[PDB]
Amino acid sequence: KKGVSSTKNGRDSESKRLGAKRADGQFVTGGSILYRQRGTKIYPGENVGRGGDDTLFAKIDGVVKFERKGRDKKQVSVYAVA
Template structure:
């Protein structure tokens, strides 16, 4: 039995923990005040109405409402339920 690990294995064995980045609440889902909508590095998604940005670029809700994406899915807003329904109706009428 070898008493030393060998050249390759002694240099391996390190792994970083996952950062759990990405969208946590999708369009149409209900957000509570303070709930995290997305975790990111940099502004991959930009903040819109009724959302805040944390020190690590986390986007979170400031009000209770529904999540709405615009600008081709790159801007995140949280709209009150009544306003969200009106926006969805207007989008459906435009089609």
């Protein structure tokens, strides 16, 4: 088994299950996380809030819709009619 040859990079962290958590078109209850992120890949929109961890959660019950903000950003919305 070789001998003394050793490497200084065998370390990593535990991945965080970030990304999307709900899709366009499903009924989310209020509080449902829609998109765990870092920084702002998606800003909150209508009836959506920003956690301390940049998490996005619905304010109220309703359907979820991802949309465009300006030329190159995205927000999120929730609408209650159900």
